[PDB]
């Protein structure tokens, strides 16, 4: 519904999302990975019509989904966006798969550093 934005600081308990968030130093405001994704792909009565949505507008839908999720998890898709710290969001997600939540809280740095390399 709404276009969400991340806070200026952009530091979510370690986890580093700079490769998927928009780059403010670009005319297009794409992410570093989106820039790679777009770099790989009239006649006798024939014409091609333009799309209704520009690719800037699509980028704005994607950044809203990213900003909603990183700050409120899945709550904004069912109602109002409810903030919760991200480290606590990750701990609930391990609980949903049957892992006890202390596994994150005692190993927060390890999971955040391993994630950052894996992405």
């Amino acid at each position: 519904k709404q276009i969400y934005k991340t806070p200026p600081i952009k530091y979510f308990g370690g986890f580093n999302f700079s490769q998927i968030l928009p780059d403010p130093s670009k005319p297009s405001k794409r992410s570093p990975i989106e820039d790679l994704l777009f770099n790989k792909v009239k006649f006798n009565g024939l014409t091609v019509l333009p799309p209704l949505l520009t690719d800037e507008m699509i980028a704005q839908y994607t950044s809203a989904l990213l900003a909603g999720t990183i700050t409120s998890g899945w709550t904004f898709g069912a109602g109002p966006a409810l903030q919760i710290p991200f480290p606590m969001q990750m701990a609930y997600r391990f609980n949903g798969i049957g892992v006890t939540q202390n596994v994150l809280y005692e190993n927060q740095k390890l999971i955040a550093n391993q994630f950052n390399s894996a992405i």
Binding site: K5, T6, L82, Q83, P85
Partner: protein, 47 residues
């Protein structure tokens, strides 16, 4: 009063009040009802 043209807007803008030690929890709720419609068949024709 005039066919105006404009650059459509994607929706209301909103910042989430994120911090590193803040949470938001609901204290009330509503029950909503919504419709969804699906076709299941056409008319059977024979020529």
């Amino acid at each position: 009063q005039s066919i105006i043209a404009y650059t459509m807007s994607l929706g209301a803008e909103n910042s989430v009040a994120y911090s590193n030690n803040s949470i938001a929890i609901p204290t009330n709720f509503t029950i909503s009802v919504t419709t969804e419609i699906l076709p299941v068949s056409m008319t059977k024709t024979s020529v």
